Amino acid sequence: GLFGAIAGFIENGWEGMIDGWYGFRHQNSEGTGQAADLKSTQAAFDQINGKLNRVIEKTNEKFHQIEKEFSEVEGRIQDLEKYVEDTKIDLWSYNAELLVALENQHTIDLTDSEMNKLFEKTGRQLRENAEDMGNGCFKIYHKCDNACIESIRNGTYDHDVYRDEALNNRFQ
């Protein structure tokens, strides 16, 4: 995708993450764990759901039309009836093909975008207390217990608290 996260700097997805579309894995002094990010997951879902509902917006209801199958050869009028219908069908078939191609490209790009948004949001939260490893992971340069990890995940991590500890670990 356009943002280079999904199938990009993030090597692969997690089959083990079954409670959300995007999320966090950590390793600290207390071990390892996984948690889904609800906000990013919800934003992807809302957009995909929105486009689905637009596409299935029921719009057409037709009653008496023209005949489309013929039991007799007739020439000019029947040629025109068949041509009109064949023309219609080709144009709608084109519309359908284009629609799915554009929608699908966009769905892949919007999901890639949401991954990227979450990554940049996290990076900004951490300020000078962490470095981007380049594979979707941050090396955090301080002691970060399970409380500290949850603080990052629920958006309440105060970077000032750990800055001195982290700045020291980073530069020598």
Partner: protein
């Protein structure tokens, strides 16, 4: 000793292939089908009024072929004509059959109002053994076969004004005998003529004597014609022989009515969309069942499947297996 925080996204063991601008096949975590490609094989009896023609075409029900008498005054949203239908009355043709069928189908009713035409000096209610009604000879219920009275067939000249506020459809015909003997025997005059007119239009038909192919014992034919009379206009029928007279008019309407050729059985269910193959659900925007449809239907396309991605790109962990 610090901490590592890795950002990621889900994957699923069983993704689906979809098409994009750049790829004809690429794997996403989920997709949904946009083309309806199946039917139950049955036409749902609701919410549209479905009238099963059974053994009858719409035109035979209109004219009043005796085995179609059950359709008198019927109405429909969709008249369904079956491939088993047959005619069993006087052999006939309709120049512009397709148009008469279309306009009646679209009107949605066979409501017929009898009018008191005065046919002075002719015999009414002629019948044929090609068109039995009970044990004896008969005819189309909505048409009146006029023949000589005594040894004369005078010039008929009759009128019916339309003083209603709706349009009247008149169905009438011209008889084409197979021999001169039949002609003069029925109508006296050696050559007939039928002229049907309103203020602004007219149709004159001269009958033609000769054999057509034998159908139910007869080489003669009737040709069927129609005339619409608007409010304030007047119908005049003028003939010195060979007139197959109207008995009245059909009420015309406009609305959502149509006709469909299908052999699918009618069943108790609800479906907005009907095809000749049966009803189809209309939750999807496209369908590949049949280009012939009636009601609130997905649009016909040539593709039998089109997948709309409903998730992200599916990227499993590569394995050394």
């Amino acid at each position: 000793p610090g901490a590592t925080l890795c950002l990621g996204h889900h994957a699923v063991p069983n993704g689906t292939l979809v098409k994009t601008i750049t790829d004809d096949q690429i794997e996403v975590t989920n997709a949904t089908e946009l083309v309806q490609s199946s039917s139950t094989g049955k036409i749902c009896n609701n919410p549209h009024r479905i009238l099963d023609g059974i053994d009858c075409t719409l035109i035979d029900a209109l004219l009043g072929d005796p085995h179609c008498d059950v359709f008198q005054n019927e109405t429909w949203d969709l008249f369904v004509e079956r491939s088993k239908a047959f005619s069993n009355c006087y052999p006939y043709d309709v120049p512009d059959y397709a148009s008469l069928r279309s306009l009646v189908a679209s009107s949605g009713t066979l409501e017929f109002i009898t009018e008191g035409f005065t046919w002075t000096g002719v015999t009414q209610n002629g019948g044929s053994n090609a068109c039995k009604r009970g044990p004896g000879s008969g005819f189309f219920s909505r048409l009146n076969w006029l023949t000589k009275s005594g040894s004369t067939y005078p010039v008929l000249n009759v009128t019916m004004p339309n003083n209603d506020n709706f349009d009247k459809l008149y169905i009438w015909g011209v008889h084409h005998p197979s021999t001169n003997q039949e002609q003069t025997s029925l109508y006296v005059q050696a050559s007939g003529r039928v002229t049907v007119s309103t203020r602004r239009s007219q149709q004159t038909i001269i009958p033609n004597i000769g054999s057509r192919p034998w159908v139910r014992g007869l080489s003669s034919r009737i040709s069927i014609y129609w005339t619409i009379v608007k409010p304030g206009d007047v119908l005049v029928i003028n003939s010195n022989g060979n007139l197959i007279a109207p008995r009245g008019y059909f009420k015309m309407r406009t609305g959502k009515s149509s006709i469909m050729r299908s052999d699918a059985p009618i069943d108790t269910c609800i479906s907005e969309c009907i095809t000749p193959n049966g009803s189809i659900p209309n939750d999807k925007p496209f369908q590949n069942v049949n280009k012939i449809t009636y009601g609130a239907c997905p649009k016909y396309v040539k593709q039998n499947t089109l997948k709309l991605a409903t998730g992200m790109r599916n990227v499993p962990e590569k394995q050394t297996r």
